[PDB]
Write an enzyme that holds these catalytic residues in place. Sequence first.
Site, PDB file in Angstrom:
ATOM      1  N   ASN A 161     -43.777  45.240 -60.402  1.00  0.00           N
ATOM      2  CA  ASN A 161     -43.541  46.666 -60.636  1.00  0.00           C
ATOM      3  C   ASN A 161     -43.474  47.074 -61.855  1.00  0.00           C
ATOM      4  OD1 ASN A 161     -43.983  46.851 -57.694  1.00  0.00           O
ATOM      5  ND2 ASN A 161     -41.579  46.821 -57.482  1.00  0.00           N
TER       6      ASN A 161
ATOM      7  N   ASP B 112     -40.523  38.034 -65.898  1.00  0.00           N
ATOM      8  CA  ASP B 112     -40.548  37.093 -64.954  1.00  0.00           C
ATOM      9  C   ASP B 112     -41.602  36.878 -64.265  1.00  0.00           C
ATOM     10  OD1 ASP B 112     -38.734  38.769 -62.534  1.00  0.00           O
ATOM     11  OD2 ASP B 112     -39.742  39.513 -64.354  1.00  0.00           O
TER      12      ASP B 112
ATOM     13  N   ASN C  85     -39.227  49.598 -62.806  1.00  0.00           N
ATOM     14  CA  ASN C  85     -40.409  50.577 -62.076  1.00  0.00           C
ATOM     15  C   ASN C  85     -40.989  51.738 -62.888  1.00  0.00           C
ATOM     16  OD1 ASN C  85     -39.453  52.905 -60.100  1.00  0.00           O
ATOM     17  ND2 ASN C  85     -37.972  51.247 -60.892  1.00  0.00           N
TER      18      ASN C  85
ATOM     19  N   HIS D 177     -34.842  39.050 -62.944  1.00  0.00           N
ATOM     20  CA  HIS D 177     -35.814  39.907 -63.237  1.00  0.00           C
ATOM     21  C   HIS D 177     -35.636  40.148 -64.584  1.00  0.00           C
ATOM     22  CE1 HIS D 177     -38.948  42.134 -61.260  1.00  0.00           C
ATOM     23  NE2 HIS D 177     -38.147  43.205 -61.010  1.00  0.00           N
TER      24      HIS D 177
END
Length: 194
Positions: free
Chosen positions: A116, A95, A70, A22
């Site tokens: 997100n 990513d 997020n 991530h």
Amino acid sequence: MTAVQLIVGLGNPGPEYDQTRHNAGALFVERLAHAQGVSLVADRKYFGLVGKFSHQGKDVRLLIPTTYMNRSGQSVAALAGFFRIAPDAILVAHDELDMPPGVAKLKTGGGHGGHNGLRDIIAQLGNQNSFHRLRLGIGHPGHSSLVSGYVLGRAPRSEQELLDTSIDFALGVLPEMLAGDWTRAMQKLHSQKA
């Protein structure tokens, strides 16, 4: 047409998330900063790490939000807002589940695709999805239910190596990206094999 003024690298802060899938975008920007000899300064005013360098009479800024993934929009909106940077002068490295490791592509606008980080940015920018994205492939686990645990995992060595190759391919087309020539940036990039 429009020169890039801001490059954002997405990721989660903290040791626990360091080096996980991530955090590809952040890794990209971090590599970029090093290559440019640019220092990333911790600035609470933009909720992240900020860097700057000059290119063609203009200031190009680098950013790695230190918010959670997020809430990255808060960071981006904060900086873009303070410097009046338009959404199309923004490049966000992130990513990409839909492409395997070792593959990197460019895209302008579109959906968040369930990411997100991207979703928050679109929202915070006043529903602007105008910006460009550097999609660094990390692969897909195979099923929707496994996705969350997969992005927060550290990829095996073979895969990290392919990602490293893709980030290197991407830095290779920086001149073109910085200039805002996305068509040439895509052609040179998109014809590269890991």
